[PDB]
Amino acid sequence: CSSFTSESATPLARGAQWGLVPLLNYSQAPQAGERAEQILLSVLAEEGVRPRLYPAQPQGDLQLVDDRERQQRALDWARQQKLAYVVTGSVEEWQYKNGLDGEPAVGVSLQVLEPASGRVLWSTSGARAGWSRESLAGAAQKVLRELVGDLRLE
Amino acid sequence: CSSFTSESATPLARGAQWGLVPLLNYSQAPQAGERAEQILLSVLAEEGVRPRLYPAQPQGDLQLVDDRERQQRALDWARQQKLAYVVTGSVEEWQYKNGLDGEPAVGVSLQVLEPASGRVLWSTSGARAGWSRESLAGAAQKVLRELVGDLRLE
Amino acid sequence: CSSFTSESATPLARGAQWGLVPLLNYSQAPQAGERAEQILLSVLAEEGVRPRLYPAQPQGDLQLVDDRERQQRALDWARQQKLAYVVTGSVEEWQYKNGLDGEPAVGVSLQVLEPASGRVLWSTSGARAGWSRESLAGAAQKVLRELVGDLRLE
Amino acid sequence: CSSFTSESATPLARGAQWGLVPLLNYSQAPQAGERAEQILLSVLAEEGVRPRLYPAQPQGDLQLVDDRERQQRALDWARQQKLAYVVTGSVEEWQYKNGLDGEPAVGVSLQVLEPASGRVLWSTSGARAGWSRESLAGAAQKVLRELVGDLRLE
Amino acid sequence: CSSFTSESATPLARGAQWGLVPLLNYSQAPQAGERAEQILLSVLAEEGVRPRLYPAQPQGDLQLVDDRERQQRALDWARQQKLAYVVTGSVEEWQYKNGLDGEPAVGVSLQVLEPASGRVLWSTSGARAGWSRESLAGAAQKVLRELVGDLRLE
Amino acid sequence: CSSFTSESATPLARGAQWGLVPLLNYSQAPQAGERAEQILLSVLAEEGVRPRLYPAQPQGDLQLVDDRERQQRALDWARQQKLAYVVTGSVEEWQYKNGLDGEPAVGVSLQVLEPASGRVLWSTSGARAGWSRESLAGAAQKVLRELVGDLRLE
Amino acid sequence: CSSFTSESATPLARGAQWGLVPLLNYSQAPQAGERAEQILLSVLAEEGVRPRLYPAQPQGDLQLVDDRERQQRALDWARQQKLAYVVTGSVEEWQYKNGLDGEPAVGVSLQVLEPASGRVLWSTSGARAGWSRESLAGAAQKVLRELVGDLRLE
Amino acid sequence: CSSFTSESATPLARGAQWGLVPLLNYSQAPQAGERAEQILLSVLAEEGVRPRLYPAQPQGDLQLVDDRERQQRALDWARQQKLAYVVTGSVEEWQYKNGLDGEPAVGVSLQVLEPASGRVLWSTSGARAGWSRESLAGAAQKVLRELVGDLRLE
Amino acid sequence: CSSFTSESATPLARGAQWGLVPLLNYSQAPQAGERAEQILLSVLAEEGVRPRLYPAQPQGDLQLVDDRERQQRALDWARQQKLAYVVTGSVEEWQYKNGLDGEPAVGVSLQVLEPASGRVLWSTSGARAGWSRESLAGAAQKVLRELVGDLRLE
Amino acid sequence: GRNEEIQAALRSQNRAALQRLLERGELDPAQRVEALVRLGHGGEALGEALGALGDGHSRDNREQLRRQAAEILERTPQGLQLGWNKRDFGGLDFKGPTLRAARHLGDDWYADLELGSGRYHGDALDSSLLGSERNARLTLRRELADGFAAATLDGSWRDDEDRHGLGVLRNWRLSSRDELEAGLDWHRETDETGLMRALGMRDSLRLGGRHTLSGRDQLSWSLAHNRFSTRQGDDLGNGEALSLEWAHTLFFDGPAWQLRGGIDYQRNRLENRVPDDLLAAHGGALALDGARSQDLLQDRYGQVYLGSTWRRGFPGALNRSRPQYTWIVDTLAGWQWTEKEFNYGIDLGIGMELLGDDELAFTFGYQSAPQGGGGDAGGTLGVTYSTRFGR
């Protein structure tokens, strides 16, 4: 039981200077954004995209740095680097529904932006409530593979 | 399961000036005396009795004030008004019995006093339980109707 | 499922100055003695006995005012009034059985004391475990009816 | 299911001055000794025994007052008068059993003492695990009836 | 389901000055030693043995006084009174099972000592786990009857 | 199910001066060493052995004073009194199991020492998991009987 | 279900001066090392081995709880008395499992060291998941018997 | 369900001076490293390897002590002592799986290090869960045997 | 499984200057009034009515908000803005019924006021316990559609 | 306090208070499982119980969790079972392998599949026409707040004639001491007689109830109206059936000892003559000579019985509920006043755990006077291997 949006924007060139900035974690699972980012890095590399990872920001106050502000600072870094595209996203659901089945429920949104203007060139959302015998990591991998697969890469 | 006592006393006269004083709550349910008083007022009017209510007082410190002394104050009001009869009583049980059926149990004693001397002219007790699909207020109304119904009025 | 003791004493006279003094509550149910007093008032009236009631007085402290202390004060009052008999008793059990849908269990003793001497003239004990759909008030009413019913009045 | 010991002593005289002093509550049920004595007084009344009850005395904190102390003072009171016999005893068990059945379990010892010497003239112990639909007070009444019944009086 | 040890000592004399000191409560049940003593006094009376009970030693702080400290202070009293024998024991188990049936489980040791020297003349141990519908007092009575019944008194 | 160790030592002498030193409690049941001591005194008496018990020397804070040190004081005492043998040991298991059977489980070690030298002349350990209908004291008695029963005495 | 390691070491002399150092309790069951040592003393005695127990020392500080510290403090003791062999070891598992069966699980490792050099001469580990109707002490006894049984003694 | 890695390294020499360094407990079971070390010492002895044990020096506050640091200290000890090989490792899982099965799950990694360089000469890991009738110690012993058995010592 | 009251008033005019003051929340669901407000705004638009929303006021302590006074203040706002009609109402029930298959229960009362004088021109109540597989928002939407649907507009 | 209020909420069946305590995560694992059972979610109760039975929690929490998990598994076992059964109805038996699987298909839906092949070896039957009987039965049980509802789909494919039946059942819980049950049956398997079992179906409308008159005493009754027809759709007779049983428990476990005493009565209006197509002469499978209508269905049957059962769990159950082994000894003595015959029966069984979380069970049953046996003794023989789904 999965659901994916179909973005109608134009194709984006694969051979460009891509970048990856941290994902926004709106799901209540801690560190879900980092896990989604790792799996998305693996999935993008499977499709031939090798984004430059944002630098590790020395955050003195983790609570102070809102995920949105971290994303904005990473966008500033990407602008400083003159990257053509920047891949980001968000995590809306990262949890096991539990009960008895314990099926994983994963929901993530994928966005590709133009760093110079900050415009959203691509926007897609995917959700999956996987099988009972499925892992959360596997469900997230499937969702991100579907989302990155839907990108119309030249 | 219901049980009622039958009084052997002589009938009372409907035409006299009836009164009503608050009921003693020996059940642990909060404010069950007031609920019983309201339903008793409704049930008495069905028969044809229109008792005059005991005027309330400021709370002040009602914690020190017990049910019996408050009822005695109400009886002082009743004798000051020259009332022939005073309907009163007590609540012994007002609760839903523990179980999976939500069964209400009501126990009400109904007394009729003479304010001139304070002697009891009528005293009956009724109990009801076992009707799982019935409301606590409905059981109380039925018990009070049976007790007020048995009150021989000429 | 009930049991009652059968006294071998001489009958008492109905046409006598009866009195009622508060019941000792040796059950651990709060205010069970007062409920027993009200239901005993109703049951006695059914048999044609109208006992004059002891004058209540609010307790300065619950711990200081013991059950037997208050009963002794009531017996002093009855002695002052020159009553022939003082009907009294105690509550040994006032509770539903533990668990869900437990039946009511009432255990009550009934005593008739001579106010002058203070000696026991009558002493009967009754216990009942009722139906699961029966109320505590109804079981107590049945027990008190049987105890007062066996009381030999002439 | 019950158990009773058979005293191997001489019968006591019914036509004598009997006394009653409080039972010792070694069961962990509060006020079980008072309930046992209240039922025992009614059970003795069946057989034509009317013991004079010990007088009530003032006290401070009842928790700090030893039961054996009160029994000793009551024995002193009995010796002060010409009481030929004193009925006493103790409550070993007074509770509904633990388990799915929750039947009443009562265990009581009945002793008769010579007040002048304090010598034990009679000593029987009774125990009962009654029907699950039986009440605790009823089971105690049955046990005390059997113990007092076995107290053959010539 | 019970087990009893058989003594290999010489029979004792029924017609002797018997005493009875406290039983040690090594079980976790409070006041189990006193309950066992009461039932043992009843059981010995069944066998024609009337022992002199230890006096009520006045104590302010019962916690400071150990159980077997009390036993020693009672054995000295037995020594002063020149009693031929003295019945001593301990309670090892006094509880219902922590299961669905809650069967009573009782274990008691019985010892007959020579008050002057303090030598042990008799030593038997008895344990029982009774039926589901059995009281703790009844099981203790059966165990004590078996222990006392094996004394082989003369 | 039970298991016992078969000592390969020489028979001991029944006609000797036996002592009895307190048993160590390595189980988590409070006062299990004392219960084992009492049942062992009863069990040895069944086999014609009458040990001399150990004097008090009353201890202070029980939870602070180590069991091994009290035992060492007891061996010192036995050394002064010129005892031939001292029976001691330890309790390893004393509990009802927490499984779905709730059977009693007891494990005890029995040791016979030479009081002066302290050499272990005998050392046997026994364990038993009894029936659900069996008592903890009964299982302990059975284990102690089998250990003492296998003891080789002359 | 059991598992035992079989060693390839040289047989050790039967007739020799053996010690017995306390065992290390690496299991989370408290006092399991002492129970293992007692059952091991019994099990060794079944094979004709009578080791000299290490003299206990007072424990007034919380730093004297480390089993390694005690074991070294006893190894030096064994060195002073010039023992040939020293049996020691550790307790790996001592518990009833929490599954449906709740069988006893015991894991014990046994070592024989040369006291002067401290070299390990023997080293075996045994584990058992016993019967659900078997006790924990019995399972430990079986494991220790098989570990000591396979020990090569001549 | 078991899985073991198969190293492709050249074999080690049985005829060499081995050492044993503590295992790193990355599982959350306390003291699992020492338990694994004891069972590993027993398992190595089965293979004919007699490692020299690290000397256990005391540490500071036991709550906060890193395993890698102790391992490094023992490596420097072994380097000082001219040991050809040092056996060490880590525990990744040491627990019973949740449920009614009581299923042990053990995960252990075995490493052999040249003390001079500190280089890893061997590294294998094993796991075992799907055997509900065996104990945790037994499972650890089987895993350690399989790892040591695959060491292919020459 | 719903119930709705049918107003007897005259129809109002669809073409007029409407308002929407906030709804009272007498249910215990926090912020149920706001959710009802949004769904009611959507439902009115479906019928052609496009009310002017009231302006948000600054808020201090959110726990001290008195819905009546804020609604009154919005009513003055409507009066100064010269609005012909004002739609308001209350939320009586907004919850899922407890237990398995807990269906959504929504109860809303809708009122159309005249801001010139505050006179109520329309007042209806609706309540619905929806299907088990229904959402609270959907039940509220259906109830409000029925309420606004029956609101006769000409 | 707080724990006192939690216990009060658990005892009083305060569904709202339990819901609050559960959502705010202030209950212990055992308390959580208890609340889940009270609120009607059995599957989530089983899940939370099995997922918390480990060393991480404290004593008596593990005990209560184990007991609750065991009782839930007794009610709704999860697992697979392979076995072979022999049931002798008296002069007629039915052997063959069986396969039973059951699991919670979701939190509130329980599935129970029971497949089985088999053959009839009977003197009164033409077993050649009655070839291998392939039986498949699917039962979807929906849990409800005050009981449950179940729908069964059972089919029996055979060379003679296929049977497709459907059954719906709704169990009500009026209180903790009372339950009621109404069910409709359509073309279902029979057990009144061997001949009816082999050649008959049943359309039945049934009512029943179970009442707890005391902690150890339970009263069970059942009222039925049954219509019996051959598998080809020819009437054999309708009737009503009444049953009433009183069960007294002496020990709840260790071993569980229970005494039962009850009465069973059936009255049926049989047709004038058995359909001719069923007779072996007219190309049928009824090899009985004469073939009187009583043989398929007795017009009057009655029995009053007393029974005693000793057991450790339930051998042959899909899930073993006791440590490492189970056994059952069940005895029944009966007095059939309609047949003037005393019926004696014993049911024996033993189970043992082989590989862990499983059970190899052997079960034996004997019954001197089976209903419709006509003086021939009946019995039961079975061997099963059961494995449990779960951690």
Numbering used by the authors:
A (entry chain L), B (entry chain H), C (entry chain G), D (entry chain F), E (entry chain E), F (entry chain D), ...: 19 to 172
J (entry chain M): 803 to 1193
Sentences from the paper on this structure:
Here, we reveal the architecture of the outer membrane complex PelBC for Pel export, where the essential periplasmic ring of twelve lipoproteins PelC is mounted on top of the nanodisc-embedded β-barrel PelB. Pel is the major constituent of P. aeruginosa pellicles, i.e., films formed at the water-air interface, and it plays a key role at early stages of the biofilm formation at solid surfaces. P. aeruginosa Pel is composed of α−1-4-linked N-acetyl-D-galactosamine residues, which are partially deacetylated in the periplasm, so the Pel exopolysaccharide acquires positive charge along the secretion pathway. The β-barrel of PelB is assumed to form a complex with PelC lipoproteins, a hallmark of the Pel system in Gram-negative bacteria.
Here, we employed cryogenic electron microscopy (cryo-EM) to visualize the structure of the PelBC complex of P. aeruginosa in the lipid-based nanodiscs, reaching a final resolution of 2.5 Å. In agreement with the prediction, the complex is composed of a single PelB barrel built of 16 antiparallel β-strands embedded in the lipid bilayer and a dodecameric ring of PelC lipoproteins mounted at the periplasmic side. At the periplasmic side of PelB, two TPR domains resolved from the residues Gly-803 and the intermediate helix (“stalk”) are located within the PelC ring, being docked at multiple lipoprotein subunits. The interior of the PelB β-barrel is predominantly negatively charged, where the charge is distributed asymmetrically, being largely concentrated on strands 11 to 14. As a major element here, a short α-helix between the strands 7 and 8 (further referred as Plug-I) is bent inwards the central cavity of PelB where it lays perpendicular to the barrel axis. Plug-I is opposed by a glycine-rich loop between the C-terminal β-strands 15 and 16 (Plug-S), and together these two loops occlude the exit tunnel of PelB. However, the exit pore within the resolved PelB structure is occluded by the glycine-rich loop Plug-S with a bottleneck width of 4 Å. However, within the assembled complex those aspartates are buried at the PelB-PelC interface and build multiple contacts with the surface-exposed arginine residues of PelB, such as 905, 944, 1018, 1114, 1122, and 1190, thus playing rather a structural role. The anchor chains of individual PelC subunits are sandwiched between two Trp-149 residues, one from the same PelC, and one from a preceding subunit, a configuration that potentially facilitates docking of the lipoproteins at the membrane interface. A fully resolved lipid molecule was located between the PelC subunits H and I, forming extensive interactions with the lipoproteins and the barrel.
